[PDB]
Design a protein around this ligand. Structure first.
Ligand code: CL
Ligand code: CL
Ligand code: CL
Length: 163
């Protein structure tokens, strides 16, 4: 575990993370995809060997010894708000199980279902709260990666408010 488990947020490409493992915002088919998924495919393409997994689950594949946790959030274009909310919460619970199983002291994590899978809605709070629900009982240092400067502000505020 980390000596004083923390949450942090950085505004940069998760493919340049400084953590012991990465969570991919994966598609269910293990395809190179778009956005975070494409960046992860370019950095760790070996991790896409048999990475296909259903919505609401996480599947870890090693790139060398570096674990890539493929977490499949729901596409809110296809799911109802209710069912999508359930699957988004479930994907993060599976990430917490994997992070725990791997014994890492740190994990880089994007906000699931906030990009192309958001169904064109702002899901920062919904996705971040499900991340906290899952990860709060883990003792890994969690570093959240985002690209938008105002998202960085809002995530940093949400972290600092519970401190
Ligand atoms: Cl960057
Ligand atoms: Cl997404
Ligand atoms: Cl963002």
């Amino acid at each position: 575990g980390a000596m004083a488990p923390s949450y942090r947020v950085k505004r940069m490409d998760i493919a340049k993370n400084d953590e012991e493992c990465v969570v991919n915002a994966a598609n269910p088919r293990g395809l190179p995809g778009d956005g975070v998924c494409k960046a992860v495919y370019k950095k760790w393409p070996e991790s896409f060997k048999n990475s296909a997994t259903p919505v609401g689950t996480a599947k870890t594949v090693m790139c060398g010894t570096y674990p890539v946790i493929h977490a499949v959030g729901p596409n809110f274009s296809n799911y109802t708000e209710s069912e999508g909310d359930r699957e988004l919460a479930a994907a993060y619970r599976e990430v917490a199980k994997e992070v725990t199983r791997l014994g890492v002291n740190s994990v880089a994590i994007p906000l699931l279902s906030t990009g192309v899978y958001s169904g064109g809605k702002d899901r920062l709070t919904q996705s971040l709260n499900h991340l906290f629900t899952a990860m709060d009982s883990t003792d890994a240092d969690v570093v959240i990666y985002c690209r938008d400067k105002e998202w960085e502000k809002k995530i940093s505020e949400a972290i600092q408010m519970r401190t």
